[PDB]
Swiss-Prot record:
It comes from Chlamydomonas reinhardtii. It is found in: Membrane. Residues 1-63 form the PAS domain. The gene is PHOT. The chain holds residues 18 to 125 of 749 of the full protein. Disulfide bonds: none annotated. This is Phototropin. Autophosphorylated in response to blue light irradiation. Expressed in gametes, pre-gametes and gametes generated by pre-gametes (at protein level). FMN binds at residues 39-44, 57, 72, 82, 103.
Length: 108
């Protein structure tokens, strides 16, 4: 299937993005100049279920994996449905270093 992929840096307190696949830019309508160094939450908007947003926020603090269905918005404002799965990446000493996320547009 069609998917995008991003990398967040968990050694920084707010998990900024540090690498995004070609499709993530092409999908969301954002450029690296507006994406790298920012938390992925810039994709959210009015109809984004605060309950699901909390499932990922909580999962990041605990360092667990997490799969949620969110309502994101492109740069032009048009909504799309994003199936997000974040995976914690730990170092040998168990601490979390990176968060990896596959995003799928399941607007169908
Ligand atoms: C976003 N993708 C995404 C990818 C990774 C690797 C991570 C760690 C998070 C996301 N998010 C969530 C966002 O960064 C944040 O964690 C949430 O907003 C919850 O935290 P707050 O502080 O806001 O309560 C993604 N969110 C999206 O909406 N779209 C994605 O593609």
């Amino acid at each position: 299937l069609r998917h995008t992929f991003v990398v967040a840096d968990a050694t920084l307190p707010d998990c900024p993005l540090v690498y995004a696949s070609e499709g993530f830019y092409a999908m969301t309508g954002y450029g690296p100049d507006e994406v790298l160094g920012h938390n992925c939450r810039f994709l959210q908007g009015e109809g984004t279920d605060p309950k699901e947003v909390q499932k990922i926020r909580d999962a990041i603090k605990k360092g667990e994996a997490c799969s949620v269905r969110l309502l994101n918005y492109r740069k032009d404002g048009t909504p799309f449905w994003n199936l997000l799965t974040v995976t914690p990446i730990k170092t040998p000493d168990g601490r979390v270093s990176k968060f990896v996320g596959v995003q799928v547009d399941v607007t169908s």
